[PDB]
Motif scaffolding. Structure first.
Motif, short mmCIF file in Angstrom:
data_model
loop_
_atom_site.label_atom_id
_atom_site.label_comp_id
_atom_site.label_asym_id
_atom_site.label_seq_id
_atom_site.Cartn_x
_atom_site.Cartn_y
_atom_site.Cartn_z
N UNK D 61 -0.51 7.92 10.29
CA UNK D 61 -1.14 6.67 10.03
C UNK D 61 -2.56 6.45 10.34
N UNK D 64 -4.53 8.35 6.90
CA UNK D 64 -4.36 7.34 6.17
C UNK D 64 -5.31 6.01 6.44
N UNK D 67 -9.08 7.43 5.86
CA UNK D 67 -8.96 7.48 4.47
C UNK D 67 -9.59 6.28 3.65
N UNK D 68 -8.76 5.46 4.01
CA UNK D 68 -8.52 3.97 3.48
C UNK D 68 -10.17 3.50 3.52
N UNK D 71 -13.37 5.15 2.15
CA UNK D 71 -13.57 4.94 0.59
C UNK D 71 -14.06 3.47 0.32
N UNK D 72 -13.70 2.58 1.14
CA UNK D 72 -14.44 1.29 1.02
C UNK D 72 -15.79 1.05 1.49
N UNK H 67 -12.33 5.56 -8.01
CA UNK H 67 -12.78 6.83 -8.25
C UNK H 67 -12.41 7.05 -9.87
N UNK H 88 -10.84 -4.39 -5.05
CA UNK H 88 -11.07 -2.94 -4.54
C UNK H 88 -10.04 -2.70 -3.36
N UNK H 92 -6.56 0.01 -2.65
CA UNK H 92 -6.66 0.81 -1.45
C UNK H 92 -5.23 0.73 -0.74
N UNK H 95 -2.94 2.71 -2.42
CA UNK H 95 -3.13 4.26 -2.23
C UNK H 95 -2.55 4.52 -0.69
N UNK H 96 -2.95 3.62 0.34
CA UNK H 96 -2.46 3.68 1.48
C UNK H 96 -0.89 3.63 1.78
N UNK H 99 0.48 6.73 -1.29
CA UNK H 99 -0.37 7.88 -1.01
C UNK H 99 -0.88 8.25 -2.19
N UNK I 85 8.16 5.93 5.08
CA UNK I 85 7.48 6.12 6.44
C UNK I 85 6.50 5.04 6.77
N UNK I 89 6.87 3.20 10.27
CA UNK I 89 5.81 3.27 10.87
C UNK I 89 5.59 1.69 11.50
#
Ligand SMILES: [Mg+2]
Ligand SMILES: [Mg+2]
Ligand SMILES: [Mg+2]
Ligand SMILES: [Mg+2]
Ligand SMILES: [Mg+2]
Ligand SMILES: [Mg+2]
Lengths: 244, 233, 239, 204, 240, 222, 212, 241, 198
Positions: D61, D64, D67-68, D71-72, H67, H88, H92, H95-96, H99, I85, I89
């Motif tokens: 978690x 993630x 990374x999130x 990026x922002x 990207x 934006x 994301x 993505x989160x 994945x 997941x 979570x």
């Protein structure tokens, strides 16, 4: 034209917005109710745009419970709402008391629903701006006052009737009924009666497609006459005219 | 030719008037007639049920709120039901909590302060209906006159509605008499009945047109419907 | 008296009326049924064509494996309805196992179109729609039309959008109320020619999607639709 | 009744003369039963590195979540997140959930693209920052790691040597901890180039 | 000029003027600060013979030590009283000590205040007179629709305010040491009669209350009974 | 910690006579080993020819009754003084009772009256809502001392026709009200003799097609 | 308590006892453990009286609403699902209840869904829940077959419940019987265990060990 | 029923309120996007000019959204930044959650749906922006999408928006071979762009560019928002002083 | 706990899952499928808390199917398992967690390769060659570590698994009433219904 804005009072103390909503119900196709010590009848003019619409699609007459039927007139979207609140109001009661709701007591709930609309609210929140564009012909039977017939008006008021007709040719029938009705009318009598005033102040050649017919009794409860019963009943009708 | 000061319940006229509330009183004058009259042993409400059509029922105008209290109405059914309904709670609150039967003076208070709100805030409109209230507490009999303008007055008798005048006068005169009718119910009524019949024009009252209500010293609030009032015609 | 949430003297809500005026402004759809099928036809506003053929949208939309719908009016709107319907389609199946009844679906949709005509400070969906499909474990073809106001209705065959009035006429004296088009093949044949009025040549402006029972479904290819234009112009010349 | 101690794993980092290093084991398993030997506790966001020990889902978690955010960041600021900056962030982040804490043990390390200064940090599950100039250790065998590192860290090693040291530090402490092992991996961060290596170890 | 919030080209809120205009139009009310305590009186107007006397009270008590009356829009008055009633009783529960008249006014002034700020609400249509005692004496004020109020030696509003005004004027000078608790009442009794001479063709019923550590005993009591009568007769003689 | 509940003894009883109904229950009230009042009624008329009683914890009890007597009143207001068929009342109570499911009314409640045919009818309640149409139920402390008895006397349980060997059970027969009240008093005395929480007095409400009758009989102040 | 229901060639069979019990003492033997949800459906009663009774009636309402809307009979699967969903809403709160929801629809054929306070929804052909569930599953397992004389199915049910009644102290009283078909359910009366037992042991010859 | 409010419906089913905004576009700098069977091009002409304005350590026409995705603005500066931001974010969350990289089609859609949102409720006005979306996802490969404030989106082969995009539009319709390798496009870009200008001539400073491309040597996708230099240069390559 | 197995092979995946259902003492159904196909090529076996189990599965199922017709394009095993997941979570720190463990088998069509993801109720995911939640691993994991080869045919896998079962029977205290086996491949899903007669 000043004085036409929902919660506004005319200087003669009148509410047009309300009064116009009534003028909506006018545009609806005709509906007629007749109460006989034998049972209660509900019949309505259908009027279909094209022959490709499946008549039964028009729910002008609907069941509210085994013991209570109904016919609407005017705004169809608004109908569905009142029909649903009502259907619910009924079941709810039965869950609470294990009995059946008094036709008027039910009717009441529905009128209680109608006039419950505010304009920013001077106290009570009422989420729904204007009044309903539809009226109702509630017709059932409780075991306290037997067979009953009612008129649901958007104004939040109502009356009990022996026979009443709402819709397009309101007076065309009300006049007729005004002098056709009498207590000791049997049920068979009543049917052929509704079936006559429709045809008259109706528009086209009367036949099962342009006219739905129903009734409700202590015996079987609210039943919507299939196209057979209606069809033949037309004959017993169009035949007696020939003579007198 | 023009008048801008009559927009919402919220705007004052240059002089200090609320036309909206003034109009509500006009719809009050439009509805059917009704009468109330008290003494020291009872209170009475008499009203003229008016029907729509000839194939329809007459719209009732009396309502109970407790064993000892009630009212009649001149105007809009909906509005009325609400007010009477709210009233019903108010008595119940007292009974349960304190276990005391609601005093009429106070009953009027609440109906003033209630209808009051609608004259001060934007959005709404005022109540289109007047009420004659009757009851029997510990200060004996009482009778009230209520207006949408939130004005509740304690009287000896009265009428409201279309052609309400002729009764108000009959009453004004026969006063000295009835205020003394104690111990006799049928008397107060016949009296009240006469006071009202003193206002008809369409025609006389029948078993279907008539309706009466009473409450007193041993007479919990009860109503007389149709053929039950038969005698008083 | 037009800014509706109020009544005309004669009891109208002109806004709700006007909204319908947009469904006419839009493209065109038509549905037909048999005793085994239900075909949905639509046209293609092939107007500023310098755009990838591939991924750019097409009227007919699947709502559940056994049910689909089409519209005419504001695309901008339409999309949002389709989405909310698709969602309710599952929310049902979840909380009731049993997959949705086409009648129910429509009623939901119509309930939404209906919701956007009550609170002040919202405007009606400029979209009228045709919804077709076959109920779970059922072989009776169902066709319904819903429109802006909130009314839902079942039709044997209906059309909406610009020039609906025309083709409607056509249909009226073609579709036999007594017996519906038997075979699928010809049930299509029908709908196709019914659109040929407004099309103005080319199966390049005609979309066909066909639906059978047991959640089968299948859109049509261009040539397939063409082999019909062909086998119809032929019998037209033969008359 | 400890969560951190359920899944297993360790992570350690060191600073060399002009570079850094960070390695972790590979084991993942519910208490006794070993489950995976391809589970990595080290990732990155452009040129920044993060090692996380503790409770498995919470680890994932977090990755993630980071990374999130990076990026922002890099997007609106047209430049990748810097080490020191990241630290202060992951710090606050841990705290925002100070009453429903994430059961983990992060460790950040990298090379600042402006000053060119090596960086390393460690934190407790709520974001307390442990700035160090030698080494950072987190995970099951925390105590065994400090025993190695204390002997082996030598201020300013050559990258090729630092590798050998850290490798041995990790590798050996891992064998006296019953809940870590099943392989390991070490990265070597230079100004530019970076080398990833997996090493051979006891598989018990 | 039509909304409540707005200002005129040279800073003026018209809705409030009309508010005032309606306050005048109604019945007349008065009050007088005397030796220790105060005295109030109003003008109930008997419009018919069907009105039970000694009944519809226009004067109201607050807590157990504050007299209070007004005129203009009757329901508006009643409403305002309630708020004053909470504020009082809340304060009391909080500080224990019965509420200081000085502040009380503000609590109300502040509430009448608000209804001049937003357009969605209607200005208070009543002028209000009141007073009571405490430790540092008795006080008496008078609140208008604008929300502006003050302390007076005696107050008046409604229809004929001048009558009682010039009437109140005199008293000041001949009794520049506060009028007798007792005489205060009977005097008020008169000052009303004199000011009623507009509704002259229409009979009426006078209502009186008062406060005093000596007479009421710190409290607010309704002047009814024996003292009440003579106080009338007293007025009835000078009524010539 | 705070204990929000308590027991005030008491024992009530309901028998459904052929065309009548009785709801009896003593007048004692207790706490620990002490007395509160020699006389304290637990059985009430609530109008519409319907008697009620809730035994267990006074407060929860009387509150229910009060909360109910009001819910009757309100039923008339909305349905034009329609009478409440006993069956209806019960379905209604179920809800009231169930309203407080996760903080129940610590009481066994019972009602009795007449159905829409004139037959007597009793209704026993759970402390949260389950209701049954009983024709005879004892609830309260003594419960287990009386129920076995009525079993026998009222239903002739385990009683056979002599000389039939044990092949013919003694047929049931319906007893007049007099007959019932005799049983009832005996039941309570016996109970008072062997139960400390029971004694003092007995108040009986008898329902019939013309009202509610009340009769009292004194028990032992043991 | 001992309730049970099973599916077969002719439809569904439901059987119950009627003994309620507080601690050691018997509070009642007159218990209705079959909730006549509506003309076409039934629910049994395990767990805790009020919960089953209440919710199952609530459910009965829920059907009426759906049915009226659709002008169609509500299908067992859904009905059951609903109850489940409602019950799940309260997992943790303390709702206790075992139950078979039985119906026979136009399409579905006969169908049983055991359902519990834990949100377990279960399609099945045989279910026994209660204290006596163990003894009842005995008689049933051995004697069941899918082609039972409509009458034998009714007899099996009786006897099964009867075994439980004898042994399981917390179970007994009288047995209630209902049969279910495409057109609704039918009651098959009440049978005092006391009397019945003596009968069975007699005709069937079983229950030897018992004196007299 | 005329002009005002978005919740209003004219007697003919028109939403003027929208139609104005949907047209307000014709005031912004000419932005263009073109597709090639190897890369996508976004070209744009700057506005708001004077001589005292930087633009290097910034932009306001070409924004990198993912990207793998990029957009060309043409409307209200204030508006754009708001959508650009939530566009934006959402990207994301995709993505989160999955994945994986968010598909262009999807992204465009969600945005068109917010713009549409403001098209139907009282108390808010529609966004006055237009976007040229350019990106890639392995589902449907390269994609060029567009959307107006009416909340409608569209797949295009090569499109323009803003100023003179009727003139500029037609120029495109001429020269365009579906395969047309990127350089011919980048080139075409200017050709189309020059022709439609009020400036005496095309100067680098007042201009914005970017491209998207992917392959076997990259294995993945790479996009470049061109810096002040590269431009001043390629401009010369297309024969410009 | 129950039995949940799964093994990834050549160009497919295989899921085993016991059939019995228990309520403290008696065993109700014993022919119960603890499966739920999410999409044409994705599938999920599960075991966990009595109610928590069947609800969650269907719920996950719902979302997917939704996404899949909305987009008209199918979702990848990888991404699927990511979302599951995600949900767990959150679930774990919710006012009430769905206590449930799972195995997710799917055939990634783009890679033309089979993927298998094991995930516990805490929200702990991992791509694996094979797995088993609960006590199920202890008894078997060895045999798998032993004989498993990535190249095994679909049949090879069954045999193996079959052997794992024979063991679980032999040394496990509980009677799991057998197993239902299922295969996910380029063709989709089918059930080895034969594992009764086999
Ligand atoms: Mg440690
Ligand atoms: Mg180790
Ligand atoms: Mg303002
Ligand atoms: Mg009843
Ligand atoms: Mg003693
Ligand atoms: Mg036993």
């Amino acid at each position: 034209e000043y004085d036409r804005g929902v919660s506004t009072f005319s200087p003669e103390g009148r509410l047009f917005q309300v009064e116009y909503s009534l003028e909506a119900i006018k545009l609806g196709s005709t509906a007629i109710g007749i109460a006989t010590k034998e049972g209660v009848v509900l019949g309505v003019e259908k009027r279909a745009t094209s022959p490709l619409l499946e008549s039964d699609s028009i729910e002008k007459i609907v069941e509210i419970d085994r013991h209570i039927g109904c016919a609407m007139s005017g705004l169809t979207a608004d109908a569905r709402s009142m029909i649903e609140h009502a259907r619910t109001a009924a079941v709810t009661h039965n869950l609470y008391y294990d009995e059946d709701i008094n036709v008027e007591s039910l009717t009441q709930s529905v009128c209680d629903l109608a006039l419950r609309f505010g304009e920013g609210a001077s106290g009570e929140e009422r989420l729904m701006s204007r009044p309903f564009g539809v009226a109702l012909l509630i017709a059932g039977h409780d075991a306290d006052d037997g067979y009953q017939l009612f008129h649901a008006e958007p104004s939040g008021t109502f009356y009990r009737y022996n026979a009443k007709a709402i819709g397009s040719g309101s007076e065309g029938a009300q006049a007729e009924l005004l002098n056709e009705w009498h207590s000791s009318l049997t049920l068979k009598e009543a049917e052929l009666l509704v079936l006559k005033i429709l045809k008259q102040v109706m528009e086209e050649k009367l036949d099962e497609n342009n006219a739905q017919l129903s009734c409700i009794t202590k015996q079987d409860g609210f039943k919507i006459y299939d196209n057979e019963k209606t069809a033949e009943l037309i004959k017993e009708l169009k035949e007696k005219e020939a003579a007198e | 030719f023009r008048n801008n000061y009559d927009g919402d319940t919220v705007t004052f006229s240059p002089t200090g008037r609320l036309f909206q509330v003034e109009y509500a009183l006009e719809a009050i004058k439009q509805g059917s007639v009704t009468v109330g009259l008290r003494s020291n042993t009872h209170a009475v409400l008499v009203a003229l049920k008016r029907n729509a059509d000839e194939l329809s029922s007459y719209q009732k105008k009396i309502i109970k709120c407790d064993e000892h209290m009630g009212l009649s109405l001149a105007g809009l059914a909906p509005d009325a039901r609400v007010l009477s309904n709210y009233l019903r709670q108010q008595c119940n609150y007292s009974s349960l909590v304190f276990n005391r039967k609601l005093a009429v003076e106070r009953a009027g208070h609440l109906l003033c302060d209630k209808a009051q709100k609608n004259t001060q805030s934007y959005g709404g409109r005022p109540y289109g209906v007047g009420l004659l209230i009757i009851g029997y507490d510990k200060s004996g009999a009482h009778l009230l006159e209520f207006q949408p303008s939130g004005n509740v007055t304690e009287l000896y008798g009265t009428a409201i509605g279309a052609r309400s005048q002729g009764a108000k006068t009959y009453l004004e005169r026969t006063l000295d008499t009835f205020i003394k009718i104690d111990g006799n119910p049928d008397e107060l009524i016949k009296a009240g009945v006469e006071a009202i019949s003193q206002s008809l024009r369409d025609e006389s009252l029948t078993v279907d047109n008539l309706s009466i209500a009473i409450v007193g010293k041993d007479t919990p609030f009860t109503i007389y419907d149709g053929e039950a009032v038969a005698k008083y015609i | 008296d037009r800014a509706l949430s109020i009544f005309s003297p004669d009891g109208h809500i002109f806004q709700v009326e006007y909204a319908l005026e947009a469904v006419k402004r839009g493209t065109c759809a038509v549905g037909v049924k048999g005793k085994n099928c239900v075909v949905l036809g639509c046209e293609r506003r092939s107007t500023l064509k310098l755009q990838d053929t591939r991924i750019t949208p097409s009227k007919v939309s699947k709502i559940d494996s056994h049910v689909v719908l089409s519209f005419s009016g504001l695309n901008a709107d339409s999309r949002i309805l389709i989405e909310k319907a698709r969602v309710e389609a599952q929310s049902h199946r979840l909380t009731l196992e049993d997959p949705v009844t086409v009648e129910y679906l429509t009623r939901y949709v119509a309930g939404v179109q209906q919701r956007y005509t009550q609170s002040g400070g919202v405007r009606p969906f400029g979209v009228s729609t045709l919804i077709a499909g076959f109920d779970p474990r059922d072989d009776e073809p169902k066709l319904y039309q819903t429109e802006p106001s909130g009314i839902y209705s079942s039709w044997s065959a209906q059309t909406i959008g610009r020039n609906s009035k025309t083709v409607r006429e056509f249909l009226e004296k073609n579709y036999d109320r007594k017996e519906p088009p038997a075979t699928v093949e010809e049930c299509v044949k029908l709908t196709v020619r019914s659109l040929l009025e407004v099309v103005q040549t080319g199966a390049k402006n005609i979309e066909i999607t066909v639906v059978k029972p047991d959640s089968d479904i299948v859109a049509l290819s261009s040539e397939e639709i063409n082999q019909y234009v062909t086998q119809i112009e032929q019998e037209k010349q033969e008359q | 009744s400890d969560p951190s101690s359920i899944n297993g794993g360790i992570v350690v980092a060191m600073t060399g003369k002009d570079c850094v290093a960070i390695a972790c084991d590979l084991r993942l398993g519910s208490q006794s039963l070993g489950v995976s030997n391809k589970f990595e506790k080290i990732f990155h966001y452009g040129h920044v590195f993060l090692g996380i020990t503790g409770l498995a889902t919470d680890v994932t978690t977090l990755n993630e979540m980071f990374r999130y955010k990076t990026n922002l960041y890099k997007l609106k600021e047209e430049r990748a997140i810097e080490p020191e900056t990241f630290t202060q962030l992951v710090s606050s982040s841990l705290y925002e959930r100070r009453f429903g804490p994430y059961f983990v043990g992060p460790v950040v390390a990298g090379i600042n693209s402006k000053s060119g200064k090596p960086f390393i940090a460690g934190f407790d599950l709520i974001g307390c920052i442990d700035e160090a100039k030698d080494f950072i250790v987190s995970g099951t065998a925390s105590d065994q790691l400090f025993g190695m590192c204390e002997s082996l860290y030598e201020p300013n090693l050559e990258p090729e040597d630092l590798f050998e040291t850290i490798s041995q530090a990790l590798l050996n402490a891992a064998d006296r901890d019953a809940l870590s092992g099943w392989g390991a991996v070490v990265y070597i961060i230079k100004k530019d180039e970076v080398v990833k290596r997996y090493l051979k170890m006891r598989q018990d | 000029d039509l909304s409540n919030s707005v200002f005129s080209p040279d800073g003026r809120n018209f809705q409030v003027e009309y508010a005032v205009k309606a306050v005048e139009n109604g019945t007349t009310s008065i009050g007088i600060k005397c030796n220790d305590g105060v005295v109030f009186a109003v003008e109930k107007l008997i419009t018919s013979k069907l009105l039970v006397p000694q009944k519809n009270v226009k004067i109201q008590v607050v807590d157990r030590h504050i007299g209070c009356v007004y005129s203009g829009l009757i329901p508006d008055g009643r409403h305002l009283v309630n708020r004053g009633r909470e504020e009082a009783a809340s304060f009391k529960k909080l500080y224990k000590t019965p509420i200081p008249i000085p502040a009380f006014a503000d609590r109300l002034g502040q509430y009448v205040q608000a209804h001049t700020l937003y357009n969605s609400v209607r200005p208070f249509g009543v002028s209000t007179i009141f007073g009571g005692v405490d430790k540092n004496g008795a006080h008496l004020y008078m609140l208008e629709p604008s929300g502006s109020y003050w302390g007076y030696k005696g107050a008046a509003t409604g229809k004929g305010r001048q009558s009682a005004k010039a009437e109140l004027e005199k008293l000041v000078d001949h009794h520049p040491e506060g009028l007798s608790a007792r005489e205060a009442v009977k005097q008020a009794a008169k000052i009303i009669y004199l000011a009623h001479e507009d509704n002259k063709e229409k009979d009426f019923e006078l209502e009186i209350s008062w406060c005093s550590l000596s007479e009421t005993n710190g409290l607010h009591k309704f002047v009814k009974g024996d003292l009440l009568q003579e106080a009338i007769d007293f007025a009835q003689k000078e009524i010539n | 910690q705070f204990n929000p509940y308590g027991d005030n003894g008491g024992t009530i009883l309901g028998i459904a006579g052929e065309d009548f109904a009785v709801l009896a229950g003593d007048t004692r009230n207790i706490t620990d080993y002490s007395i509160n009042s020699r006389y304290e009624p637990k059985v009430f008329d609530c109008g519409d020819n319907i008697v009620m009683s809730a035994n267990g914890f006074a407060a929860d009890g009387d509150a229910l009754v009060k909360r109910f007597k009001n819910s009757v009143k309100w039923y008339h207001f909305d349905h034009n003084d329609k009478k409440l068929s006993i069956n209806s009342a019960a379905r209604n109570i179920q809800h009231l009772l169930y309203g407080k499911r996760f903080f129940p009314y610590y009481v066994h409640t019972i009602i009795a009256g007449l159905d829409e045919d004139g037959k007597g009818a009793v209704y026993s309640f759970d402390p949260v809502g389950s209701y049954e149409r009983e024709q005879c139920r004892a609830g309260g402390a003594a419960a287990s001392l009386i129920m076995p008895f009525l079993d026998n006397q009222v239903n002739f349980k385990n009683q056979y026709e002599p000389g039939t060997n044990g092949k013919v059970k003694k047929p049931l027969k319906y007893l007049s009200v007099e007959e019932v009240i005799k049983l009832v008093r005996d039941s309570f005395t016996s109970a008072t003799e062997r139960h400390i929480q029971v004694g003092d007095g007995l108040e009986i409400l008898i329902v019939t097609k013309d009202g509610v009758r009340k009769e009292f009989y004194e028990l032992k102040r043991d | 308590t001992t309730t049970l229901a099973f599916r077969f060639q002719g439809g569904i069979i439901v059987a119950v006892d009627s003994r309620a019990t507080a601690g050691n003492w018997v509070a009642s033997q007159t218990v209705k453990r079959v909730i006549e949800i509506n003309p076409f459906l039934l629910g049994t009663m395990a767990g805790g009286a009020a919960d089953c009774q209440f919710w199952e009636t609530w459910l009965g309402s829920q059907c009426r609403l759906h049915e009226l809307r659709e002008k169609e009979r509500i299908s067992v699967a859904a009905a059951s699902k609903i109850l489940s969903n409602l019950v799940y809403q309260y997992k943790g709160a303390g709702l206790s209840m075992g139950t078979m929801i039985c119906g026979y629809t136009r399409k579905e054929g006969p169908t049983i869904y055991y359902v519990d306070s834990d949100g377990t929804r279960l399609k099945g052909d045989i279910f026994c829940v209660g204290s006596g569930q163990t003894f009842a599953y005995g008689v049933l397992d051995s004697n069941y077959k899918w082609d039972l004389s409509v009458e034998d199915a009714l007899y099996l049910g009786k006897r099964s419940i009867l075994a439980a009644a004898h042994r399981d102290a917390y179970s007994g009283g009288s047995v209630n019987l209902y049969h279910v078909t495409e057109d609704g359910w039918i009651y098959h009366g009440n049978h005092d265990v006391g009397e019945l037992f003596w009968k069975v042991k007699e005709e069937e010859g079983s229950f030897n060990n018992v004196i007299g | 029923r005329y002009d005002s409010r978005t919740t209003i419906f004219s007697p003919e089913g028109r939403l003027y309120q929208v139609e104005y905004a949907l047209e307000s576009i014709s005031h912004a700098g000419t932005a263009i996007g073109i597709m090639a069977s190897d890369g996508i091009v976004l070209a744009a002409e700057r506005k708001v000019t004077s001589t005292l304005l930087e633009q290097d350590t910034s932009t306001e026409k070409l924004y990198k959204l993912n990207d793998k995705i990029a957009v060309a603005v043409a409307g209200l500066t204030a508006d754009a930044e708001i959508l650009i931001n939530t566009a934006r974010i959402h990207a994301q969350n995709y993505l989160k959650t999955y994945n994986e990289d968010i598909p262009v089609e999807i992204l465009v859609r969600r945005l068109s749906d917010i713009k549409q949102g403001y098209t139907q409720h009282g108390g808010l006005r529609p966004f006055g922006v237009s976007f040229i979306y350019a990106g890639y996802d392995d589902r449907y490969g390269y994609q060029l999408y567009t959307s107006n404030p009416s909340g409608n989106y569209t797949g295009w082969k090569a499109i323009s928006v803003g100023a003179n995009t009727s003139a500029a539009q037609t120029l495109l319709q001429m020269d365009y071979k579906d395969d047309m390798k990127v350089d011919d496009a980048i080139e075409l870009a200017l050709k189309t762009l020059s022709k439609t200008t009020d400036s005496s001539a095309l100067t680098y400073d007042r201009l914005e560019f970017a491209t998207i491309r992917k392959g076997a040597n990259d294995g993945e996708v790479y996009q470049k928002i061109f810096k002040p230099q590269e431009i001043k240069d390629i401009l010369v390559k297309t024969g410009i002083t | 706990m129950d039995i949940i197995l799964g093994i990834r092979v050549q160009d497919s995946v295989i899921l085993a899952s016991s059939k019995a259902v228990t309520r403290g003492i008696s065993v109700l159904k014993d022919s119960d499928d603890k499966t739920r196909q999410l999409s044409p090529h994705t599938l999920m076996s599960f075991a966990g808390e009595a109610g928590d189990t069947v609800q969650f599965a269907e719920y996950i199922q719902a979302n997917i199917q939704l996404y899949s017709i909305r987009e008209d394009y199918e979702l990848s095993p990888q991404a699927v398992s990511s979302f599951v997941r995600q949900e767990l979570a959150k679930s774990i720190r919710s006012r009430r967690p769905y206590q449930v463990n799972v195995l997710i088998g799917g055939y990634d069509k783009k890679k033309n390769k089979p993927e298998l993801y094991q995930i516990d109720y805490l929200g702990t995911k991992v791509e694996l060659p094979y797995g088993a939640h609960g006590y199920s691993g202890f008894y078997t994991f060895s045999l798998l570590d032993h004989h498993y080869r990535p190249d095994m045919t679909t049949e090879e896998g069954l045999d193996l698994l079959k052997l794992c079962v024979q063991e679980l029977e032999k040394r496990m205290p509980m009677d799991f009433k057998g197993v239902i086996v299922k295969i996910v491949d380029k063709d989709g899903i089918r059930q080895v219904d034969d594992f009764q007669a086999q």
